[PDB]
Design a protein around this ligand. Sequence first.
Ligand SMILES: [C]OC1=[C]C2=C([C]=[C]1)C(O[C])=[C]C(C(=O)[N]C1=[C]C(C(=O)N([C])[C]C3=[C][C]=[C][C]=[C]3)=[C]C([B]([O])=O)=[C]1)=N2
Ligand SMILES: [C]OC1=[C]C2=C([C]=[C]1)C(O[C])=[C]C(C(=O)[N]C1=[C]C(C(=O)N([C])[C]C3=[C][C]=[C][C]=[C]3)=[C]C([B]([O])=O)=[C]1)=N2
Ligand SMILES: [Mg+2]
Ligand SMILES: [Mg+2]
Ligand SMILES: [Mg+2]
Ligand SMILES: [Mg+2]
Lengths: 355, 355
Amino acid sequence: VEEYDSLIEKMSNWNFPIFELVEKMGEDSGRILSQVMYTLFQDTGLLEIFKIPTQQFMNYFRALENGYRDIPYHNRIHATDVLHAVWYLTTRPVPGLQQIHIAYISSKSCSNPDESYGCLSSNIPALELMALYVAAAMHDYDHPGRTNEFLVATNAPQAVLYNDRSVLENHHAASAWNLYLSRPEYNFLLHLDHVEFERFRFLVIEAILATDLKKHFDFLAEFNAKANDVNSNGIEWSNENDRLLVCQVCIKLADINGPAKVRDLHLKWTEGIVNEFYEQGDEEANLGLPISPFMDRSDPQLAKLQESFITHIVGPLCNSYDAAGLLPGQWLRIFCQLMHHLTENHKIWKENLYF
Amino acid sequence: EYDSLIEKMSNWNFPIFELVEKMGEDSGRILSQVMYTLFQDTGLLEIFKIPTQQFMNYFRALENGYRDIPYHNRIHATDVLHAVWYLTTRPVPGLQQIHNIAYISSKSCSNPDESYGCLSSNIPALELMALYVAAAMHDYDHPGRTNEFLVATNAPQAVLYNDRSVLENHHAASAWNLYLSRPEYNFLLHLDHVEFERFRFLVIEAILATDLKKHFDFLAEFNAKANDVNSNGIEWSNENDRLLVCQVCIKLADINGPAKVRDLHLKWTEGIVNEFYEQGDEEANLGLPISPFMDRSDPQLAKLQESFITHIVGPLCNSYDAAGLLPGQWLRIFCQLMHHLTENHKIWKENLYFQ
Ligand SMILES: [C]OC1=[C]C2=C([C]=[C]1)C(O[C])=[C]C(C(=O)[N]C1=[C]C(C(=O)N([C])[C]C3=[C][C]=[C][C]=[C]3)=[C]C([B]([O])=O)=[C]1)=N2
Ligand SMILES: [C]OC1=[C]C2=C([C]=[C]1)C(O[C])=[C]C(C(=O)[N]C1=[C]C(C(=O)N([C])[C]C3=[C][C]=[C][C]=[C]3)=[C]C([B]([O])=O)=[C]1)=N2
Ligand SMILES: [Mg+2]
Ligand SMILES: [Mg+2]
Ligand SMILES: [Mg+2]
Ligand SMILES: [Mg+2]
């Protein structure tokens, strides 16, 4: 209860210094995702709204956590960071977004300054935002630190099992749900009815499956058509598919936040993913496979990787989200914190490349 | 045996149940024998230098993976394989030829003249083999339940595949898993990494197209390309246009019954309802709502047949026929299975309206 208010205050910062929390937990850093999950459901009130008994909640997420491996990047910490991002993006105030309001959540840890500000929490039903948060928690569960391309190339059992389509992302969702159903001391959704649960599950899976970057430009196209058509009105908040698509793009952005954060955090995350890349290159080399781009430890091209990734993947996504007026910011023109971070970071790396 | 069979199968209404009966004790080998026969007829054995031993090893395994169930069995698999072969080889009125990169011709007929074309002339041999192999696999290890049943009951397969195309993913996944499960099966040993990778892709795409939840999606996409009056139809040079044609081809092959002689249509109908009723029997036992048309003690057999021919089969055949891809002959044009389809559609409309 003392600890609760300490943490919720730290996480109200977009640049939540998570690695300090991992260090502060030291010995019990393995429980980071379960503690943050609890904290955020309390903050959003999702516990009271769906009458979630704490024992099972904690049972499940404690299991989920342990399903994340001890690997540089695709671990409990990443899962937690992404969960934070989606929560922040869906709760915090957005300039010029209409409010509207089947239950809906509010973050106890802030009210919309005025009526010129809206929250996604006001426009997306609580059931749907819970899916997104739970999806964030699961989205990389039991990730083996290899890419889809690697698994397909090597005809890995998983790759065969899923016919080479969204191999990891299907496995994340499948083994996560398999866990949830694997014992009754996990069924924290016991107070949702058949239809609510069916739907919840659907929404979670769609959210997880959207994190595959092979589908990146497809998702991005579909979103600009709906949201960023100049002759259309953007997002019909009343429409089921328009709401899902918003959440899909939200988690997509949450999953790759680093370049839109302070350098300190961006670089820590970078360190993690390349270390995971190099382990894969090490294995590729051993099996006599062509070493994937930017995975040859004896040739980083770290500037080229960062710039390419910001330019081709992160940049266009954030601009679509920003153009659609869905990014939390404040009035002056509008100041969008992570668009500043993204631009500052994009410039630093353009610089290291050119010179 | 060879010349006997190939002559019988040159009939669109190939009387398969006679062949199953004629094979009697060796009726379990029907799919492997027909597979062999048709690759010989098309010359696919010589073109990809396929060693018979492994070919037969694999397909004999594949056969055994088909269960002893009313409808989704080796016989259905064989029927569908026949349909795709017939549709892709036989002469099509008014279709341009192009190449008759390897292409096949059926030893068991030449285009009567230059006013006739074959699909075999317009789709590469690699791609048509995928289709045929896909037909063979397309229902492998089918448990005689619907996707909706497996999803409803949170069956392990349904969880494994996150409720998307559950059976169709399993058909392709466990089929390929078998092919790779021992080297005495590798009949494609003379394709290079790229050719094989691609072949596999094409096979899976073909199998996954047989999910009827994607029916209206596939149907839309096809009429857009093929039957647009302001577009120039099918670019036979284009990879995606050719795949889509094969997808629609197998789609149509999987549900051919209504476009066959009433004798055959009704035999197939008998099979599927017997499979339906076994599922209803189980639904009843688990205290689940019995799915439409699955309560043996209440067939509504006319309503099922009429609905299915009108809403699923009818529109598909008309799209294929409008796009001028159906084998037929000049007079106007007589399309045999359009006649069958219409006569059958009328007989069922009649049993409904009147009885
Ligand atoms: C959150 O903070 C950051 C996250 C960063 C990052 C920097 C900060 C970064 O700097 C260059 C790179 C990545 C990155 O590559 N993540 C990632 C990649 C793939 C993958 O699919 N790869 C490498 C093939 C691919 C690349 C481009 C397009 C398609 C495929 C799968 C997963 B995952 O979590 O499952 C995650 N993430
Ligand atoms: C080859 O010749 C014939 C084939 C016939 C047929 C008559 C002749 C027939 O008469 C009623 C019905 C069927 C049929 O239903 N096949 C089938 C259906 C579904 C399915 O998805 N069902 C039942 C829900 C559904 C029904 C209609 C529309 C959408 C969904 C899954 C699979 B399978 O193999 O997995 C196979 N096939
Ligand atoms: Mg991932
Ligand atoms: Mg991730
Ligand atoms: Mg099927
Ligand atoms: Mg079938």
